Design an enzyme around this catalytic site. Structure first.
Site, PDB file in Angstrom:
ATOM      1  N   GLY A  58      68.479  69.320-100.801  1.00 28.80           N
ATOM      2  CA  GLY A  58      68.000  69.225-102.169  1.00 28.80           C
ATOM      3  C   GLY A  58      66.986  70.273-102.565  1.00 28.80           C
ATOM      4  N   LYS A 114      69.637  72.368-105.518  1.00 29.51           N
ATOM      5  CA  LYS A 114      69.076  72.719-106.822  1.00 29.51           C
ATOM      6  C   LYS A 114      69.711  73.969-107.449  1.00 29.51           C
ATOM      7  CE  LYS A 114      65.913  69.538-107.974  1.00 29.51           C
ATOM      8  NZ  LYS A 114      66.874  68.460-107.617  1.00 29.51           N
ATOM      9  N   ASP A 164      64.589  64.630-111.835  1.00 30.14           N
ATOM     10  CA  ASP A 164      63.398  65.263-111.293  1.00 30.14           C
ATOM     11  C   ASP A 164      63.353  66.704-111.829  1.00 30.14           C
ATOM     12  OD1 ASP A 164      65.831  65.639-109.458  1.00 30.14           O
ATOM     13  OD2 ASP A 164      64.450  66.898-108.291  1.00 30.14           O
ATOM     14  N   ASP A 165      62.159  67.267-111.938  1.00 35.62           N
ATOM     15  CA  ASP A 165      61.918  68.645-112.380  1.00 35.62           C
ATOM     16  C   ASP A 165      62.359  68.932-113.839  1.00 35.62           C
ATOM     17  OD1 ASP A 165      62.113  68.390-109.416  1.00 35.62           O
ATOM     18  OD2 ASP A 165      61.556  70.509-109.390  1.00 35.62           O
ATOM     19  N   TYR A 202      58.772  60.542-109.741  1.00 35.58           N
ATOM     20  CA  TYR A 202      59.261  60.314-108.368  1.00 35.58           C
ATOM     21  C   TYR A 202      58.175  60.309-107.299  1.00 35.58           C
ATOM     22  CZ  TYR A 202      59.096  65.435-108.654  1.00 35.58           C
ATOM     23  OH  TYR A 202      58.723  66.732-108.884  1.00 35.58           O
ATOM     24  N   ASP A 213      60.596  75.546 -99.590  1.00 33.59           N
ATOM     25  CA  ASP A 213      60.917  76.447-100.689  1.00 33.59           C
ATOM     26  C   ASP A 213      59.593  76.969-101.326  1.00 33.59           C
ATOM     27  OD1 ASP A 213      60.601  73.973-102.015  1.00 33.59           O
ATOM     28  OD2 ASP A 213      62.747  73.776-102.407  1.00 33.59           O
ATOM     29  N   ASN A 221      64.437  66.376 -96.984  1.00 31.29           N
ATOM     30  CA  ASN A 221      64.708  67.647 -97.634  1.00 31.29           C
ATOM     31  C   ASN A 221      63.960  68.626 -96.665  1.00 31.29           C
ATOM     32  OD1 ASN A 221      65.442  69.596 -99.546  1.00 31.29           O
ATOM     33  ND2 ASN A 221      63.677  69.189-100.860  1.00 31.29           N
TER      34      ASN A 221
HETATM   35  C1  LIG Z   1      62.826  64.903-105.650  1.00 31.11           C
HETATM   36  C2  LIG Z   1      62.216  66.237-105.358  1.00 31.11           C
HETATM   37  O1  LIG Z   1      61.325  66.376-104.562  1.00 31.11           O
HETATM   38  N1  LIG Z   1      62.753  67.293-106.084  1.00 31.11           N
HETATM   39  C3  LIG Z   1      62.354  68.661-105.986  1.00 31.11           C
HETATM   40  C4  LIG Z   1      60.841  68.860-106.078  1.00 31.11           C
HETATM   41  N2  LIG Z   1      60.324  68.786-107.323  1.00 31.11           N
HETATM   42  O2  LIG Z   1      58.981  68.945-107.724  1.00 31.11           O
HETATM   43  C5  LIG Z   1      58.372  70.176-107.310  1.00 31.11           C
HETATM   44  O3  LIG Z   1      58.941  71.293-107.537  1.00 31.11           O
HETATM   45  N3  LIG Z   1      57.081  69.854-106.794  1.00 31.11           N
HETATM   46  C6  LIG Z   1      56.109  70.661-106.087  1.00 31.11           C
HETATM   47  C7  LIG Z   1      56.508  71.810-105.366  1.00 31.11           C
HETATM   48  C8  LIG Z   1      55.709  72.296-104.312  1.00 31.11           C
HETATM   49  C9  LIG Z   1      54.496  71.695-103.975  1.00 31.11           C
HETATM   50  C10 LIG Z   1      54.054  70.593-104.731  1.00 31.11           C
HETATM   51  C11 LIG Z   1      54.852  70.085-105.784  1.00 31.11           C
HETATM   52  O4  LIG Z   1      60.140  69.081-104.887  1.00 31.11           O
HETATM   53  C12 LIG Z   1      60.687  69.900-103.804  1.00 31.11           C
HETATM   54  C13 LIG Z   1      59.733  71.105-103.705  1.00 31.11           C
HETATM   55  O5  LIG Z   1      59.753  71.515-102.413  1.00 31.11           O
HETATM   56  C14 LIG Z   1      62.099  70.429-104.095  1.00 31.11           C
HETATM   57  O6  LIG Z   1      62.688  70.970-102.975  1.00 31.11           O
HETATM   58  C15 LIG Z   1      62.975  69.310-104.699  1.00 31.11           C
HETATM   59  O7  LIG Z   1      64.142  69.886-105.078  1.00 31.11           O
END
Ligand SMILES: CC(=O)N[C@H]1/C(=N/OC(=O)Nc2ccccc2)O[C@H](CO)[C@@H](O)[C@@H]1O
Ligand SMILES: CC(=O)N[C@H]1/C(=N/OC(=O)Nc2ccccc2)O[C@H](CO)[C@@H](O)[C@@H]1O
EC number: 3.2.1.169
Lengths: 120, 302, 120, 304
Positions: free
Chosen positions: D10, D41, D117-118, D162, D228, D256
């Site tokens: 994801g 994504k 999400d996002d 979430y 990521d 993830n």
């Molecule tokens: C449900 C979820 O966590 N979705 C995304 C997700 N969505 O919110 C963010 O982009 N949050 C964020 C990113 C980095 C550090 C703190 C918050 O978090 C991960 C970021 O690593 C992604 O890989 C996911 O695709």
């Protein structure tokens, strides 16, 4: 009124020109990036009306680095993007922090990052 | 006049794939560049496990590749780096090297390269006895292979002292380069990286200094866009630091580019814009060349 | 008497144990990691016993290099390639960290990093 | 009982190849894990250009992957992220999703998910008119798509709020999660990423708090080993900060992990070890340093 459909705006020549200056040469920086480091150093060094206008165009300069990624991230051929994602994702992020820092100046990288943070 | 202009795939790291290499030729042909030197430091059957003969499928692929170089009007050069564990005096070694290149000739390759870059400056107890100095041993086997292959039109030799820094006492007085220039056949070309590994600038006098001792015009291995040494650094800049006045004083320019293949467009395009500008021995502007490269590239995104 | 043939020392468990400590968790450094970091912070302040720790630091630095060295030479290039970026960058940052400790007793990173540095 | 334990591809960035994906299933099964959530994504068809149906080869490849998932007895869940440009009020849109999932159903997929999400908390004027709240919009479509698919066994839902640090005004008092808790169907399992996006610890306490307001035990989308956000970093550490005591209080844990596929050995090994350790217990058992020594060992035999 319905929700506007997600549209991809294409990578511009400016997008590419910005990218080329962001990742230039070994012994050099690209003017567009060399200028961006000049301006961030100066803006950090102040607390006139000029700062308010210079810090503004620098936030536009930052959003450009960010937008450049979005447009590269949305084009049909992924192959180009993916072979550079590492380097381009990071510049986009640091530039995103640098934009926000300046906004507030108006009112990481792992263990290798940390050791490179101690040498002069 | 003959000038080897193109790309050297001579970096450390995950080597390119047949379909990338194929697209490289299309690009190289389109930009009027002629050469291509196969030097992937990883490819086991090139550096460490050089002795090993290629597999049945490996063979078919290389064949299909060499054939694609011809189709795209590109000069295919096959390099082999023995230097590591090779015994310069054991004729079994020399024979196994000969057997390896024979297989390459079978695929359709006509142009070869013996590489001696990034290796311990010491010969074993056997080679120490048989040959005078370390240059003598390399030159011996290089000439023997140049001759065994029926003296090819394109035969490249990379020395261990391939740049200015790496020369002791210095370029004009190194006894290593002296032996190379003196005992190496004039037919065999010599690779150079300029005054450093990743040269910032390649001044004409710097080439004049090495041409003088190697007693011939060098073929530049250009690490300007090489990025193996920092997978945290990308190079989307133009082919700067090399004067167009170098072109009639060199036999060629083979650019070692970024490991990331797709990122090399600008580096190859700008090299071509540089070469084309003064083939016929301010014609080149890096800043200008860059806009051309970036303009042409923008099309591939869609 | 002839040139000893090329051989590859295999990957040890103690190497993995070191690797995993270098690239540990998002909020925690690996024991070995945080340790290497501690010494470099200390050796920086003082410059004139100290020398014995500095030799044991350079001993630890070498292990990271060696760790990369064996990781590369292994049969499974597939594993290595996924983390080439990281391992190559940690071995490189260690070399310049070691070659700095040697200089003290004896009396890079790109634009994105250049921005990261001029921030708190 | 039923418990979903595995990996969720994801993340943002270059997605795994269906070649790598088949290998992950083998690895998952070997460690007694049972789930794969398809949520990369990137893949235009998954998030951005979600309406767009898969091509011939695209269809061919997904079928093979779904088939491999059956072969290695791993549950394949196909997630969809339509949230960016979807007009919830428009039935033509609903029908486009129905059509999109039918194509995946026609590859062998029986398990599905809908993620939100996002994406921003603001709806368009048409949606504003029809639904009383944003939570009300997402609940309608999810519930509709659930019923249409024929109330499947595995149906996942990811809220916009979430994680703890993403609920307006807080976890318990959030009107959004209350609307979901109440109106979303019981069969639909809810995804939760813990107190933060990338949670240091997922406290048992915090899980009973969120379990209450969503009126069900969630399915954790663990971003612990994700990398990521900082492509300069990699995570080879053991699965730390989640008590074995969460296992009886959750419907599952999907990790993830790092984008770089091969680095996820310790990540997915220590997760399997954590699960197997308090598997059957209903309401210590797992040591991370111990879990890691065990992982690094099983990993070392991939090198040679
Ligand atoms: C449900 C979820 O966590 N979705 C995304 C997700 N969505 O919110 C963010 O982009 N949050 C964020 C990113 C980095 C550090 C703190 C918050 O978090 C991960 C970021 O690593 C992604 O890989 C996911 O695709
Ligand atoms: C002839 C030549 O330049 N050979 C190698 C070569 N060998 O020495 C190094 O690895 N040198 C080095 C690396 C970074 C900066 C300065 C020197 O240079 C390139 C460096 O990226 C390698 O890719 C080449 O394989």
């Amino acid at each position: 009124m319905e929700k506007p459909l997600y549209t991809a705006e294409p990578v511009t020549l400016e997008d590419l020109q910005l990218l080329a200056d962001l990742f230039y040469l070994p012994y050099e920086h690209g003017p567009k990036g060399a200028q961006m480091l000049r301006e961030f150093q100066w803006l950090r060094a102040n607390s006139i009306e000029e700062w308010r206008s210079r810090a503004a165009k620098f936030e536009e300069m930052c959003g450009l680095v960010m937008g450049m990624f979005t447009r590269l991230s949305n084009c049909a051929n992924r192959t180009i993007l993916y072979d550079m994602y590492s380097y381009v994702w990071d510049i986009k992020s640091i530039m995103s922090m640098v934009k926000s820092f300046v906004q507030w100046l108006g009112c990481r990288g792992g263990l290798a990052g940390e050791f490179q943070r101690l040498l002069p | 006049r003959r000038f080897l202009c193109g790309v050297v795939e001579g970096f450390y790291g995950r080597p390119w794939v047949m379909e990338q290499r194929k697209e490289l030729f299309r690009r190289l042909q389109k930009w009027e560049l002629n050469t291509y030197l196969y030097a992937p430091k990883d490819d086991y059957k090139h550096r460490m496990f050089w002795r090993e003969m290629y597999s049945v499928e490996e063979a078919e692929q290389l064949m299909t590749l060499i054939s694609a170089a011809r189709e795209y009007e590109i000069e295919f050069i096959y390099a082999i780096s023995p230097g590591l564990d090779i015994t310069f005096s054991n004729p079994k070694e020399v024979s196994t090297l000969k057997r390896k290149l024979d297989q390459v000739s079978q695929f359709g390759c006509r142009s070869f390269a013996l590489l001696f870059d990034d290796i311990d400056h010491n010969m074993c107890a056997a080679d120490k006895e048989v040959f005078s100095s370390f240059a003598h041993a390399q030159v011996s086997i290089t000439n023997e292979i140049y001759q065994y292959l029926g003296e090819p039109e394109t035969f490249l030799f990379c020395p261990t002292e391939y740049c200015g820094t790496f020369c002791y006492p210095n370029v004009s007085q190194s006894p290593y380069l002296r032996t190379v220039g003196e005992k190496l056949l004039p037919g065999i070309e010599v690779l150079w990286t300029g005054p450093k590994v990743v040269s910032k600038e390649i001044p004409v006098e710097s080439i004049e200094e090495v041409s003088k001792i190697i007693k011939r015009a060098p073929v530049i291995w250009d690490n300007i866009h090489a990025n193996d040494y920092d997978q945290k650094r990308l190079f989307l800049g133009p082919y700067k630091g090399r004067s167009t006045e170098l072109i009639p004083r060199l036999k060629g320019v083979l650019t070692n580019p970024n490991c990331e293949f797709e990122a090399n467009y600008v580096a190859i395009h700008t090299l071509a814009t540089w070469y084309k500008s003064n083939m016929n021995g301010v014609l080149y502007s890096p800043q200008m060349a860059l806009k051309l490269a970036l303009t042409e590239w923008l099309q591939e995104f869609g």
